[PDB]
Design a protein around this motif. Structure first.
Motif, PDB file in Angstrom:
ATOM      1  N   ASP A 258     -10.658  39.418 118.866  1.00 10.06           N
ATOM      2  CA  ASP A 258     -10.413  40.195 117.716  1.00 10.06           C
ATOM      3  C   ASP A 258     -11.076  41.702 118.198  1.00 10.06           C
ATOM      4  O   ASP A 258     -12.188  41.726 118.376  1.00 10.06           O
TER       5      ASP A 258
ATOM      6  N   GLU B 135      -6.800  42.352 107.404  1.00  9.15           N
ATOM      7  CA  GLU B 135      -8.167  42.574 106.697  1.00  9.15           C
ATOM      8  C   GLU B 135      -8.033  44.025 106.354  1.00  9.15           C
ATOM      9  O   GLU B 135      -7.384  44.789 106.988  1.00  9.15           O
TER      10      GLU B 135
ATOM     11  N   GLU C 201      -5.886  42.196 115.250  1.00  7.35           N
ATOM     12  CA  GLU C 201      -6.323  43.908 115.184  1.00  7.35           C
ATOM     13  C   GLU C 201      -6.614  44.452 116.381  1.00  7.35           C
ATOM     14  O   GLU C 201      -7.557  44.986 116.635  1.00  7.35           O
TER      15      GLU C 201
HETATM   16 MG   LIG Z   1     -11.242  40.372 112.237  1.00  5.67          MG
END
Ligand SMILES: [Mg+2]
Ligand SMILES: [Mg+2]
Length: 390
Positions: free
Chosen positions: A206, A262, A233
Motif C-alpha cells: 500500500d 479508501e 493506492e
Molecule cells: Mg490503504
C-alpha cells in the motif's frame, strides 16, 4: 436485506446511550507514505441502544444528544424500509447497535441474519484476514539490512499470533526519505517480509498514493518473484494510468490485483472498476458502513468485482467486516490490527492460519462490559430516554 417479519410494531427505541471506549494497539504504528506516526492509542465511539427492554451495542458516529432525542420512541420497524434495509438517516449512527440488538433478540449472529445464498445455514464463518500493522517503523535506521530485520521481526510478531498474509506500507520515498533510497528501502522491506511469510503468504503493498506510474512499474518489476496479491493506492485513482498499468501487468504475466477506494475516492471509481481498471474496492467499514456495503457488495458481485472494506483507526470495524463476508460473495479479507479496547471482549474471535474465526454467538459476538460502559456513559458520555414522541 434483513428478515423483518419477526419485528413487532410494539418494539420502540426506549433509550440511546453513548460512550467513548479507549485502548491500545499491540505495537505503535509509525508513518505511512503520506503522513507521520499513527501511534499506539486507540478509541471506539459506541452507542448502547435499548429496545423492548433489551440492549444492543455498536459503533456509532455522527450522533449528537440532540440527534438521539428525535429517535426516542420511534418503532424499530420504522427505521427500516420494507426491503429490510436500515434507512440512510440512521446508518452511521445506529446500524451497528441495531443489528447487534436484532441478533441478541433473535439469538443469532449478525452474519446469520444477513447471510447471502453463497453461505448456507449452520455453517461456521471463517474469513481470510491480513496483518495491516506493517507501517514505516524503520525510519530511525540508516542501514537497509537493519530496517529489513526490524520489519521482518514485526511480521514475525503477527505470524506468531496466527497471521499468514501481510499488507506492507510502501512509498517511503514520497515524503519521508529521499526518493531513490526510499524506493530501494521499500523493495528490500517487501522482499524481506515475503521471506519470513513463506511461499503461501499473500503480500499486499500500500503506497498511500506516494508513487507515480513509472515508480509503480519499477517496484512491481523488482518484486516479480514475490507473492504479491494486490497493489493498493499506488497513486490517486486515474482510469488512464490504471488501464496502462493493467496492460503492462498482463503482458508480463504478473498477476497482481489493483485495489483502491479508501478516503476521498474518485466519484467514478466504480465505473472504472466495471471497465476492468480496478479489481478490489475498499470503501470504509464504518463510513459509508455496513448497510451500504451490503447494497454495494451485491452490485460488485454482479460485476465479478471484489470487496475489501477499509478498516483502520476503529477496532470495532474489524469484527463488523467479518460478519459482512456472509452477505457479500466476493469478500476478500478482514483488515486486521491487533488492538485491546477496555470493556470490549473480542475473545469469541480467534486468529488461526491467516483466517478469523467468527463466533456463532448472538449479535456481533462482542461481549461489552456493561458495568464499565455504564461508568463511562455517566462520567464522559450521555443518555437520552423517555418514551414515544415527539
Ligand atoms: Mg490503504
Ligand atoms: Mg485511492
Amino acid at each position: 436485506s434483513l428478515n423483518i417479519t419477526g419485528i413487532q410494531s410494539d418494539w420502540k427505541v426506549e433509550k440511546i446511550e453513548f460512550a467513548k471506549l479507549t485502548g491500545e494497539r499491540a505495537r505503535s504504528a509509525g508513518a505511512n507514505g503520506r503522513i507521520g506516526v499513527h501511534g499506539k492509542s486507540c478509541t471506539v465511539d459506541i452507542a448502547r441502544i435499548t429496545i423492548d427492554g433489551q440492549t444492543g451495542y455498536g459503533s456509532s458516529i455522527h450522533m449528537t444528544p440532540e440527534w438521539a432525542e428525535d429517535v426516542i420512541g420511534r418503532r424499530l420497524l420504522d427505521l427500516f424500509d420494507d426491503r429490510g434495509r436500515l434507512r440512510e438517516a440512521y446508518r452511521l449512527q445506529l446500524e451497528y447497535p441495531v443489528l447487534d440488538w436484532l441478533g441478541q433478540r433473535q439469538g443469532k449472529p449478525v452474519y446469520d441474519l444477513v447471510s447471502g445464498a453463497h453461505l448456507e445455514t449452520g455453517a461456521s464463518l471463517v474469513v481470510p484476514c491480513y496483518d495491516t500493522s506493517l507501517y514505516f517503523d524503520d525510519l530511525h535506521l540508516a542501514d537497509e539490512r537493519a530496517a529489513v530485520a526490524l520489519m521482518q521481526e514485526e511480521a514475525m510478531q503477527g505470524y506468531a499470533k496466527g497471521q499468514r498474509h501481510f499488507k506492507i506500507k510502501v512509498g517511503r520515498g514520497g515524503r519521508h526519505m529521499p526518493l531513490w533510497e526510499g524506493t530501494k528501502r521499500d523493495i528490500a522491506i517487501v522482499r524481506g517480509i515475503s521471506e519470513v511469510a513463506g511461499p503461501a503468504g499473500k503480500i499486499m503493498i500500500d503506497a498511500n498514493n506516494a508513487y507515480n506510474l513509472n515508480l509503480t512499474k519499477e517496484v512491481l518489476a523488482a518484486l516479480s518473484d514475490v507473492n504479491l496479491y494486490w497493489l493498493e493506492e499506488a497513486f490517486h485513482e486515474d482510469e488512464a494510468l490504471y488501464e496502462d498499468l493493467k496492460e503492462w501487468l498482463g503482458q508480463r504475466g504478473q498477476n497482481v490485483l489493483i485495489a483502491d477506494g479508501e478516503g476521498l475516492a474518485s466519484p467514478h471509481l466504480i465505473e472504472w472498476a466495471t471497465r476492468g481498471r480496478v479489481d478490489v474496492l475498499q470503501y470504509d467499514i464504518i463510513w459509508p458502513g455496513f448497510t451500504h456495503w451490503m447494497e454495494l457488495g451485491e452490485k460488485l458481485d454482479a460485476h465479478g468485482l471484489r470487496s475489501a472494506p477499509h478498516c483502520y483507526g476503529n477496532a470495532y470495524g474489524i469484527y463488523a467486516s467479518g460478519h459482512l463476508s456472509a452477505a457479500v460473495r466476493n469478500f476478500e479479507f478482514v483488515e486486521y490490527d491487533d488492538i485491546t479496547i477496555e470493556g470490549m471482549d473480542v475473545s469469541g474471535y480467534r486468529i488461526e492460519n491467516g483466517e478469523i474465526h467468527v463466533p456463532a454467538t448472538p449479535g456481533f459476538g462482542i461481549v461489552f462490559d456493561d458495568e464499565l460502559v455504564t461508568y463511562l456513559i455517566n462520567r464522559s458520555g450521555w443518555s437520552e430516554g423517555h418514551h414515544h414522541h415527539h
